[PDB]
mmCIF file of N, CA and C in Angstrom:
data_model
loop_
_atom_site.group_PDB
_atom_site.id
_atom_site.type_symbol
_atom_site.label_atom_id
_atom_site.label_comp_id
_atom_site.label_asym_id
_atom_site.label_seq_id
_atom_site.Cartn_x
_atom_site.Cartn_y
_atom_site.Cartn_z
ATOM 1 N N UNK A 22 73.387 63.004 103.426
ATOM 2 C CA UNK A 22 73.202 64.447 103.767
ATOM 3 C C UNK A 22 74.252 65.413 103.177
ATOM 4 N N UNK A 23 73.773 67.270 103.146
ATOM 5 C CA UNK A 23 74.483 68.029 102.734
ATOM 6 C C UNK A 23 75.700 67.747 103.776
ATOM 7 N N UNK A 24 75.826 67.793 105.286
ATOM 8 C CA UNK A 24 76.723 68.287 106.073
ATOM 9 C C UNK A 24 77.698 67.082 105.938
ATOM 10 N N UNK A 25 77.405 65.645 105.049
ATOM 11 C CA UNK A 25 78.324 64.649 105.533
ATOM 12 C C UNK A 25 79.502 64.771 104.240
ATOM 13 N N UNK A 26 78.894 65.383 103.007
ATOM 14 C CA UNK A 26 79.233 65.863 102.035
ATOM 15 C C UNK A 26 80.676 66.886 102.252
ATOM 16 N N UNK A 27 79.684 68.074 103.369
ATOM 17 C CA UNK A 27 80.898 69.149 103.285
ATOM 18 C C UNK A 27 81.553 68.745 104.131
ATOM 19 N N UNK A 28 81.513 67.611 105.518
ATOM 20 C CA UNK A 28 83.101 66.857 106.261
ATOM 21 C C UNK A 28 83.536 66.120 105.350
ATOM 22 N N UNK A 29 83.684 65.498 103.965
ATOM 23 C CA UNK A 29 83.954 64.447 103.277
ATOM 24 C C UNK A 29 84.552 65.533 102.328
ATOM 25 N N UNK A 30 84.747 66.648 101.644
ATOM 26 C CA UNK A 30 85.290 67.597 101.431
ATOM 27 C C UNK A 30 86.603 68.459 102.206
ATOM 28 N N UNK A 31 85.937 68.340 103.194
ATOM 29 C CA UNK A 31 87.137 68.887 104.564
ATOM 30 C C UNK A 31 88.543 67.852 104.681
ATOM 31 N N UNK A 32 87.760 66.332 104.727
ATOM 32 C CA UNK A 32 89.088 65.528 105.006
ATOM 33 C C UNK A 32 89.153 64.958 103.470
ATOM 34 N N UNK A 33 88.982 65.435 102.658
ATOM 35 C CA UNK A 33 89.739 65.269 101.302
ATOM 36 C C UNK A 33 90.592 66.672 101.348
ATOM 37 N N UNK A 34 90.230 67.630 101.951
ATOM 38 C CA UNK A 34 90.963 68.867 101.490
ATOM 39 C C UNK A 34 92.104 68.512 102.676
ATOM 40 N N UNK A 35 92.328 67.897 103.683
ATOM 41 C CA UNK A 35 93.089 67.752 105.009
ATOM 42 C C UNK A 35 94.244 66.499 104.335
ATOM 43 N N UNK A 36 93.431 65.851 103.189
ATOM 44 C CA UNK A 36 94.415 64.245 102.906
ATOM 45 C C UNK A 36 95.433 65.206 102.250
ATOM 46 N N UNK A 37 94.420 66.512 100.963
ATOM 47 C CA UNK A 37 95.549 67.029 99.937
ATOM 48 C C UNK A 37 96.582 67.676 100.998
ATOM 49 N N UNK A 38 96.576 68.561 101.871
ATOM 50 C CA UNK A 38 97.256 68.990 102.504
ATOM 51 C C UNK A 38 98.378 68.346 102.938
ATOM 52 N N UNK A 39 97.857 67.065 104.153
ATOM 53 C CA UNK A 39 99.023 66.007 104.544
ATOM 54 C C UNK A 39 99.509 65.121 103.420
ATOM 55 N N UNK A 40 99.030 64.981 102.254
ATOM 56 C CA UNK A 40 99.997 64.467 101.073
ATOM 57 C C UNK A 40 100.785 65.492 100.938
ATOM 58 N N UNK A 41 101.145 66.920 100.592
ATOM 59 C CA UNK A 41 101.628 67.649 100.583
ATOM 60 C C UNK A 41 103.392 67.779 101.717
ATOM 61 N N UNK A 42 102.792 67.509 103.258
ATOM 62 C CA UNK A 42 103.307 67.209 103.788
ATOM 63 C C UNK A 42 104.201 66.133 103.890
ATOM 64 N N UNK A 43 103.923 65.192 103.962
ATOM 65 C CA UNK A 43 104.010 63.818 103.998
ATOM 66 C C UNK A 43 105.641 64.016 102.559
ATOM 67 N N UNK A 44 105.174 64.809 101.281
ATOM 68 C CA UNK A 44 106.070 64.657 100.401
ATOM 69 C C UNK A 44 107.300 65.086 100.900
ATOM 70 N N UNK A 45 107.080 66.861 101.651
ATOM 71 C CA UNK A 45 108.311 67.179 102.251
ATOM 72 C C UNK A 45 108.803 67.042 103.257
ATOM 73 N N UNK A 46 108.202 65.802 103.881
ATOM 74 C CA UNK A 46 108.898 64.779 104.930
ATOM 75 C C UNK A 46 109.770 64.092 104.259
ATOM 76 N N UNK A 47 109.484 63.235 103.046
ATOM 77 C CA UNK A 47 110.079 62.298 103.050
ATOM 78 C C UNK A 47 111.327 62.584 101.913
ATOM 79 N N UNK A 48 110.872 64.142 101.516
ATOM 80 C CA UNK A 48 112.477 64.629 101.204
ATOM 81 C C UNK A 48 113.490 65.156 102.255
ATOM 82 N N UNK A 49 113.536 64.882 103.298
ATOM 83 C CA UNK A 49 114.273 64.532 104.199
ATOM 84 C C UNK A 49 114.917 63.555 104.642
ATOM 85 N N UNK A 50 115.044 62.727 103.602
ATOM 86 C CA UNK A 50 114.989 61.262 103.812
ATOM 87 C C UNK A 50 115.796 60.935 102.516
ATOM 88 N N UNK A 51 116.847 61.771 101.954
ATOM 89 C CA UNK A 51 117.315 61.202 100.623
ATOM 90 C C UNK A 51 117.979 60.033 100.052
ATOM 91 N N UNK A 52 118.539 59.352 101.487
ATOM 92 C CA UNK A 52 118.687 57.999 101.397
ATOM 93 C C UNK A 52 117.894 56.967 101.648
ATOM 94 N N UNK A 53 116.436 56.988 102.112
ATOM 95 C CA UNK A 53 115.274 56.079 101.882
ATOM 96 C C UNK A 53 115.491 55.538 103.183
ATOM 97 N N UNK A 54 116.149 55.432 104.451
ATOM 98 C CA UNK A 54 116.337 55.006 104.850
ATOM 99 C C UNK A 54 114.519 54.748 105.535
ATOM 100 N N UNK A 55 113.844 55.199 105.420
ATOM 101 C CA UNK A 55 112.652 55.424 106.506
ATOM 102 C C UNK A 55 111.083 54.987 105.500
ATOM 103 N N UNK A 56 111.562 54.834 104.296
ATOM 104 C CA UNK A 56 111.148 55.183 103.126
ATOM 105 C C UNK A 56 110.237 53.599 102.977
ATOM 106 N N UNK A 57 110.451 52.155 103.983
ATOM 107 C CA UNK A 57 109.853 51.370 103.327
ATOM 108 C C UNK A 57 109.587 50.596 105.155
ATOM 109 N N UNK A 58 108.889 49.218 105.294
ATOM 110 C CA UNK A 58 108.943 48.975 106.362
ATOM 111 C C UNK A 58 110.154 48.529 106.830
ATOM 112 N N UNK A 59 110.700 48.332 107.964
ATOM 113 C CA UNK A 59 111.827 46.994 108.162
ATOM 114 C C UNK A 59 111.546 45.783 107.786
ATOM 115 N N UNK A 60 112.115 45.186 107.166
ATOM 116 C CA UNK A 60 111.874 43.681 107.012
ATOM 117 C C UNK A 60 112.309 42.730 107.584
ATOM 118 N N UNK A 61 111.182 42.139 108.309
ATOM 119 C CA UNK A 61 110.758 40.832 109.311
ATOM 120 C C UNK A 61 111.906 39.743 108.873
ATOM 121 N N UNK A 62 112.271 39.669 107.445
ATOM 122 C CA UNK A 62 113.070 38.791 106.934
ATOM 123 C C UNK A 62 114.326 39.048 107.410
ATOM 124 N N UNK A 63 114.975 40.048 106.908
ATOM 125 C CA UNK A 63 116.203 40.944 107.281
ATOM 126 C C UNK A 63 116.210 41.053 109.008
ATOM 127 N N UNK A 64 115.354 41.613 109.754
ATOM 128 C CA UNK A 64 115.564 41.828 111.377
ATOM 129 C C UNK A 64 114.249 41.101 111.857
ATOM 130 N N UNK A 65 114.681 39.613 112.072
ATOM 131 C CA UNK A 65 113.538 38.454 112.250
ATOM 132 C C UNK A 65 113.385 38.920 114.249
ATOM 133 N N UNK A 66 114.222 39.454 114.905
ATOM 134 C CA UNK A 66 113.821 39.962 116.057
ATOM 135 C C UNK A 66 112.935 41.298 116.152
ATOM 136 N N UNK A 67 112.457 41.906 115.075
ATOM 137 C CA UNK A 67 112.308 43.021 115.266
ATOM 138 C C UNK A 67 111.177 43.279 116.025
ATOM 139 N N UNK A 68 110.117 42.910 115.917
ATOM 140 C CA UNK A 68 108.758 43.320 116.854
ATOM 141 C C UNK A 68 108.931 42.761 118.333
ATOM 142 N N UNK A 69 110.136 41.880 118.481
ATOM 143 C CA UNK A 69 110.393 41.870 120.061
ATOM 144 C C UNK A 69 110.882 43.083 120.695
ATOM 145 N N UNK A 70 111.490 44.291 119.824
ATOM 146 C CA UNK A 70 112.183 45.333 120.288
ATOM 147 C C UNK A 70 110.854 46.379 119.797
ATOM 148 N N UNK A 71 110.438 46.341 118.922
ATOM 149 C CA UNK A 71 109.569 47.576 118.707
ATOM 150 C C UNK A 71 107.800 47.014 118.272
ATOM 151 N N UNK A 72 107.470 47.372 118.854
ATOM 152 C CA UNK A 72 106.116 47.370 119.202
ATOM 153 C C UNK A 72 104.848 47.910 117.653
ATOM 154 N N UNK A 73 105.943 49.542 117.739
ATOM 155 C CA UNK A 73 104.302 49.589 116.555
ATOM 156 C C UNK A 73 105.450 50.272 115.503
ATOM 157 N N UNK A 74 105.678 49.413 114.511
ATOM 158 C CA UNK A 74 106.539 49.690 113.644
ATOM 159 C C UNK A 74 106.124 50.604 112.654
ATOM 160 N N UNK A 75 106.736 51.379 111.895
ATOM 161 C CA UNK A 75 106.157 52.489 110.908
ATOM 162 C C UNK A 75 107.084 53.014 109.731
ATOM 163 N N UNK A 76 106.886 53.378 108.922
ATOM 164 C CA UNK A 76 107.269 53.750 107.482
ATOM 165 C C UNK A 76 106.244 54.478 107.102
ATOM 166 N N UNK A 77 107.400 55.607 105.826
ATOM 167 C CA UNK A 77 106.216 56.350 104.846
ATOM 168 C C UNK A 77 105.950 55.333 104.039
ATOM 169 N N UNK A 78 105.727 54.285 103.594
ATOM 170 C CA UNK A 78 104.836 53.772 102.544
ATOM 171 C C UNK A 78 103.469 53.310 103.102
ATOM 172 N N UNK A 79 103.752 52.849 104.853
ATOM 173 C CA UNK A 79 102.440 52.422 105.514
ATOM 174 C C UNK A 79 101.896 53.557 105.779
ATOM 175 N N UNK A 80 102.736 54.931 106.010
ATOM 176 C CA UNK A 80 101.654 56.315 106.499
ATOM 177 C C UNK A 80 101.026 56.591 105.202
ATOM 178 N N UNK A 81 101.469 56.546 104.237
ATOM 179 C CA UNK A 81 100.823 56.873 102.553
ATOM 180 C C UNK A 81 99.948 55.823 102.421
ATOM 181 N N UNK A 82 100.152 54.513 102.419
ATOM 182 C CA UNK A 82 98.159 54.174 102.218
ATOM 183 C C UNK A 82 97.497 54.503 103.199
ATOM 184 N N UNK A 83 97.771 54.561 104.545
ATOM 185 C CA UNK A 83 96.719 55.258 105.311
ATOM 186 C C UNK A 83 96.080 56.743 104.600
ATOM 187 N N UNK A 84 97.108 57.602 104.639
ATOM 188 C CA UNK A 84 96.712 58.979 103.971
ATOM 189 C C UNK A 84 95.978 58.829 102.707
ATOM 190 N N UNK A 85 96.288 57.733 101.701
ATOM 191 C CA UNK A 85 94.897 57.465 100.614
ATOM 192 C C UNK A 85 93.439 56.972 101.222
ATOM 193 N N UNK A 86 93.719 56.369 102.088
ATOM 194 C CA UNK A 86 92.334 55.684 102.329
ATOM 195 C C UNK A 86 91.595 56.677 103.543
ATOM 196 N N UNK A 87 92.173 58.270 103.327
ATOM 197 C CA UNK A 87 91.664 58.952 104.152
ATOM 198 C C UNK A 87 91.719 58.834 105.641
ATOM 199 N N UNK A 88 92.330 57.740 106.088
ATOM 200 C CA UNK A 88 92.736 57.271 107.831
ATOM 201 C C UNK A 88 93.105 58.187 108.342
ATOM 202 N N UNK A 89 93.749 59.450 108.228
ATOM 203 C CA UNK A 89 94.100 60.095 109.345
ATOM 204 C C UNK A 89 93.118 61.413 109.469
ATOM 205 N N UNK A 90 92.347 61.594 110.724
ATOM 206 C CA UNK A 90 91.328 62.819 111.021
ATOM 207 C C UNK A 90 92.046 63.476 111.061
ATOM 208 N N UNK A 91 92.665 64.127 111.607
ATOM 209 C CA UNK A 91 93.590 65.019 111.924
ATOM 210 C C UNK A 91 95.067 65.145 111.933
ATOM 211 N N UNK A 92 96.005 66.244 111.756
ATOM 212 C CA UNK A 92 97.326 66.401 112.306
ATOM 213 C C UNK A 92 97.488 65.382 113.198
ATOM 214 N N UNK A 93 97.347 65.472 114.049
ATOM 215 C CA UNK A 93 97.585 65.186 115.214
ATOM 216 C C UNK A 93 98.112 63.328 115.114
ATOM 217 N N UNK A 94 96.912 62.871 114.441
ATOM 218 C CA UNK A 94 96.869 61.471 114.208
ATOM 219 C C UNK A 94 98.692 61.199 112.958
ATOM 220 N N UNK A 95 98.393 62.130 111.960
ATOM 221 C CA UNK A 95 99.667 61.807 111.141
ATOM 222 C C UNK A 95 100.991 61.773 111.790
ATOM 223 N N UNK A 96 101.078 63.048 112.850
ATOM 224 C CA UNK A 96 102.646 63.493 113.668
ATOM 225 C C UNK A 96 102.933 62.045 114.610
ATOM 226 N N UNK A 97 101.837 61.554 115.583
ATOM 227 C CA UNK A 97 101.578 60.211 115.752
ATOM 228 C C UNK A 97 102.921 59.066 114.977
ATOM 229 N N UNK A 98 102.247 58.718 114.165
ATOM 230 C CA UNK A 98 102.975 58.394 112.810
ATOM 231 C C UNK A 98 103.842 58.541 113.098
ATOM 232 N N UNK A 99 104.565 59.890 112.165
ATOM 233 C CA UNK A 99 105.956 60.215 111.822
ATOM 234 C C UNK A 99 107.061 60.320 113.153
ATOM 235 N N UNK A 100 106.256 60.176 114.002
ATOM 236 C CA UNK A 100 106.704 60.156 115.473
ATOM 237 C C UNK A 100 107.192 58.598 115.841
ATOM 238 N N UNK A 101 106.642 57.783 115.430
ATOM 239 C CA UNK A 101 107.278 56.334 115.538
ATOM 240 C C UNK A 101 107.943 55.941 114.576
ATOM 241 N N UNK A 102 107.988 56.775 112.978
ATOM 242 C CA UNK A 102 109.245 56.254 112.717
ATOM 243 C C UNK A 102 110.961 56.636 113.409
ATOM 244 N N UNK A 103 110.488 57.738 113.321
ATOM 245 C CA UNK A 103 111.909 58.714 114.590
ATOM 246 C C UNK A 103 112.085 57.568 115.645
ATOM 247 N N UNK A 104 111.173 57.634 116.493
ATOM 248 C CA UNK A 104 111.383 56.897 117.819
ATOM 249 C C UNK A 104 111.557 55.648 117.637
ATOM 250 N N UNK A 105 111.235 54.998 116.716
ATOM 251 C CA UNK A 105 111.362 53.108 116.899
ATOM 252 C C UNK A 105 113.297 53.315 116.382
ATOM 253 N N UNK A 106 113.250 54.317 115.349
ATOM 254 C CA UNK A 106 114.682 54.073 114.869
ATOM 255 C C UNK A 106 116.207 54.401 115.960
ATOM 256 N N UNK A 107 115.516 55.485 116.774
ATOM 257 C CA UNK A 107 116.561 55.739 117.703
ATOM 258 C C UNK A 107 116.385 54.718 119.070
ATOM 259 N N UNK A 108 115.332 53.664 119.045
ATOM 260 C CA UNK A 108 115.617 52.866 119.993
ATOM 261 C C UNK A 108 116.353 51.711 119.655
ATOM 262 N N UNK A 109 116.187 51.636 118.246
ATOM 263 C CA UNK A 109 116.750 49.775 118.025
ATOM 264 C C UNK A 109 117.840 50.043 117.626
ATOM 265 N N UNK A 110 118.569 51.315 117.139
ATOM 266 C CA UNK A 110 119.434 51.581 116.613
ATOM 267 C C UNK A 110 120.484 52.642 117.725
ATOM 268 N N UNK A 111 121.660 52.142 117.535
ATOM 269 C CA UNK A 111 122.484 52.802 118.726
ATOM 270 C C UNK A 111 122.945 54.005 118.501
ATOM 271 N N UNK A 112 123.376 55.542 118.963
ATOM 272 C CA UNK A 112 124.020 56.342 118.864
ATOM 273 C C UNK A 112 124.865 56.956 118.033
ATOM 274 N N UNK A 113 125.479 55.687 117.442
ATOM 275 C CA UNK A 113 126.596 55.885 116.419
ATOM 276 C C UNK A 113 126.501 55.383 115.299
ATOM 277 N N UNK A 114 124.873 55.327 114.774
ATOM 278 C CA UNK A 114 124.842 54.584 113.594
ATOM 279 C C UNK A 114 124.565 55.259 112.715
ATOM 280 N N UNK A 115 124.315 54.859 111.255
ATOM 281 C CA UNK A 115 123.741 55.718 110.062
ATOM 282 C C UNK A 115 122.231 56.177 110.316
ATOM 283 N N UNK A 116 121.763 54.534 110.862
ATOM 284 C CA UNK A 116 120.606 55.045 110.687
ATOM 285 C C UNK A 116 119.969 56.087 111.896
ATOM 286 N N UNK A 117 120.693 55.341 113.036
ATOM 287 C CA UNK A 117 119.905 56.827 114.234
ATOM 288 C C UNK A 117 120.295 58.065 114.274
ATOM 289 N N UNK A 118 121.392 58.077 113.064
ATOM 290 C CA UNK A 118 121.564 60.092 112.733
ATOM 291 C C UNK A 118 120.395 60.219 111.365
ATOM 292 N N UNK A 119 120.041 59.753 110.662
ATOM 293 C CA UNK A 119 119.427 59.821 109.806
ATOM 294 C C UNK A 119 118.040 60.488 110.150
ATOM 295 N N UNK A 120 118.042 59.495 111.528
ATOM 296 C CA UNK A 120 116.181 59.881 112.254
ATOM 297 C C UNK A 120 116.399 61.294 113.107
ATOM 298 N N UNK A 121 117.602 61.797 113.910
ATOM 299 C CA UNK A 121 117.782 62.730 113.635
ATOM 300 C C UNK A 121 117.547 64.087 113.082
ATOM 301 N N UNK A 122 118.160 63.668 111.921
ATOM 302 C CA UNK A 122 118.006 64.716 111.087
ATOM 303 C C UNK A 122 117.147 65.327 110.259
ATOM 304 N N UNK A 123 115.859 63.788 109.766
ATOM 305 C CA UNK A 123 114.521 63.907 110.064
ATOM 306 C C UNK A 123 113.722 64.437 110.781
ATOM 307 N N UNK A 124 114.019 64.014 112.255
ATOM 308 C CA UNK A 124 113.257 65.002 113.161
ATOM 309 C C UNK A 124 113.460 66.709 112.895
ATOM 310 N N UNK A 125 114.523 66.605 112.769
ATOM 311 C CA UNK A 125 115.408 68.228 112.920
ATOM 312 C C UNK A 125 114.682 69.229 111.852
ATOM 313 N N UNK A 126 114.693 68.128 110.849
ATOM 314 C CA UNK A 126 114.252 68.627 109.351
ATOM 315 C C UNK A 126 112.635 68.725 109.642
ATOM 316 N N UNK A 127 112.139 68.126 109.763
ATOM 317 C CA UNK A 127 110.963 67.821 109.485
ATOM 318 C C UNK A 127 109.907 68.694 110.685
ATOM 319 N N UNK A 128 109.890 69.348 111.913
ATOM 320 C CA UNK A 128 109.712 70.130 112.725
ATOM 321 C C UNK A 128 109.661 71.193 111.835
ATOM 322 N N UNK A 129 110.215 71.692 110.914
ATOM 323 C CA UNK A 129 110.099 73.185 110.405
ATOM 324 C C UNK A 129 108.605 73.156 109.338
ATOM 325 N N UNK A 130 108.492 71.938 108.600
ATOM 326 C CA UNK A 130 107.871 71.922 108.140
ATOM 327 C C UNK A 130 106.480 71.227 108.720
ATOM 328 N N UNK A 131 106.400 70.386 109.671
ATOM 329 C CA UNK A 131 105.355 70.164 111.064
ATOM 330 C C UNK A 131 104.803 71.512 111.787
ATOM 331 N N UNK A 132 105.756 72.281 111.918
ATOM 332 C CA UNK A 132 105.150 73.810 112.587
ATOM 333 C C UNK A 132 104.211 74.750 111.572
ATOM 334 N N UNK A 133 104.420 74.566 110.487
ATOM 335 C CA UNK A 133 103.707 75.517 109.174
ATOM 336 C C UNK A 133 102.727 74.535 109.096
ATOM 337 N N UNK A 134 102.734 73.121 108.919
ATOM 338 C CA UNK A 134 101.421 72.589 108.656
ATOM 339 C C UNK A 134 100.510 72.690 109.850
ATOM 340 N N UNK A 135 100.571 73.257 110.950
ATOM 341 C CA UNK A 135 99.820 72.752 112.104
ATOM 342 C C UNK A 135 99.083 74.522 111.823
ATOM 343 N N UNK A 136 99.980 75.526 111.755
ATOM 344 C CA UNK A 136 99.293 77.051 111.286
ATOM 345 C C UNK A 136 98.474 76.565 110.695
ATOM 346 N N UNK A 137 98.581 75.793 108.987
ATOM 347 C CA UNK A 137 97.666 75.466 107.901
ATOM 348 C C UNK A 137 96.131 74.443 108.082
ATOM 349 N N UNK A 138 96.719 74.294 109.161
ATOM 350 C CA UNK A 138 95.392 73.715 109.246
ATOM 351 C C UNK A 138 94.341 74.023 110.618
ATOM 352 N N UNK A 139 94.669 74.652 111.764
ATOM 353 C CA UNK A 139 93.996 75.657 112.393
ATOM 354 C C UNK A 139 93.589 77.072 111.492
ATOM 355 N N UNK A 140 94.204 77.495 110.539
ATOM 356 C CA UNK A 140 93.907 78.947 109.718
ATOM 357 C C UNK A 140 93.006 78.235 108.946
ATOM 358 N N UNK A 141 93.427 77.343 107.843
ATOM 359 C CA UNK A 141 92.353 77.136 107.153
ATOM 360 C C UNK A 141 90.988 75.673 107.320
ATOM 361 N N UNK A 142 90.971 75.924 108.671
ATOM 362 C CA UNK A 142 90.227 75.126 109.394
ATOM 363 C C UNK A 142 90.379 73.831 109.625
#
């Protein structure tokens, strides 16, 4: 059908957008720290402490294969990399200021995409 056409248009025009996003997330991130998964090898306890683990390389094939409907579903996401990092990681580390400053950073540019996509539907 025409109408499955013009939603299949919508969330190609919603992927270009959150690729967009997604980029100036992860220039917030100039030391990569967030940038790949944890490795099971490296922290063989890790899924005993964190549950639903996350990285931009796993939110980026989702965002190719069109997986996320909405905002809502991506912030999701970028929301467990923040949160898994400030739980396994203590107060005074590199990496839980890093997530931090991510969050800090990344809210300015989360608030303009959420306008961009209620304005332009």
């Amino acid at each position: 059908s025409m109408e499955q056409v013009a939603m299949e248009l919508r969330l190609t025009e919603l992927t270009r957008l959150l690729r967009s996003v997604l980029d100036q997330l992860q220039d917030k991130d100039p030391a990569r720290i967030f940038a790949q998964p944890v490795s099971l090898k490296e922290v063989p306890d890790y899924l005993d402490h964190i549950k639903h683990p996350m990285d931009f390389a796993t939110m980026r094939k989702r965002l190719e294969a069109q997986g996320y409907k909405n905002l809502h579903e991506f912030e999701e996401d970028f929301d467990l990399i923040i949160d898994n990092c400030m739980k396994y990681n203590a107060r005074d580390t590199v990496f839980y200021r890093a997530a931090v400053r991510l969050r800090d950073q990344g809210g300015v540019v989360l608030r303009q995409a959420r306008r961009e996509v209620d304005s332009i539907g």
